[PDB]
């Protein structure tokens, strides 16, 4: 999945450059039930040469009060993507939808009507209308550059 597209040496160096204490980022997970999800977070401090202690913007510890803190590695952290807040989704577009406090990969199945866009999620096999404000085009962070899907 992962490394076929990115370069480890480059990705590590760029993560070291960009993700210092206080830096806003997005983080991902390879735990089940989280595939194609990016969560908003902020770097607390780098950890060793490979990892970053982050504090989540929206996710909480079990009391639902204190922000969740986790270590993440350089392959599961990225900057917030540039967002073109005013664009027209076309059917077939790979998007992210802000759903249950994460950004989830989905596909546009119906163009915008009444300020909503029809979306489908392969993870859950569910489809629904999403307000335009909670949608963005999917982008990949690769070797220090943002790229659209191939």
């Amino acid at each position: 999945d992962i490394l076929a597209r990115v370069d480890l040496e480059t990705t590590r160096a760029i993560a070291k450059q960009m993700f210092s204490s206080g830096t806003v980022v997005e983080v991902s997970s390879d735990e089940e039930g989280f595939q194609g999800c990016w969560f908003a977070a902020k770097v607390v401090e780098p950890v060793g040469e490979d990892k970053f202690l982050v504090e989540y913007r929206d996710l909480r510890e079990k009391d639902g009060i204190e922000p969740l803190k986790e270590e993440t590695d350089f392959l599961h952290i990225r900057p917030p993507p540039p967002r073109d807040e005013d664009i027209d989704f076309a059917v077939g577009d790979k998007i992210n939808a802000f759903y249950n406090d994460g950004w989830w990969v989905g596909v546009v199945i119906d163009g915008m009507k009444h300020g909503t866009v029809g979306i489908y999620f392969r993870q859950s096999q569910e489809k629904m209308r999403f307000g335009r404000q909670g949608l963005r085009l999917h982008k990949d962070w690769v070797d220090g550059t943002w790229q659209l899907p191939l």
Partner: peptide, 10 residues
């Protein structure tokens, strides 16, 4: 906000 498993799917 929500807990990490309130955000988890399936």
């Amino acid at each position: 906000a929500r807990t990490k498993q309130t955000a988890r799917k399936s």
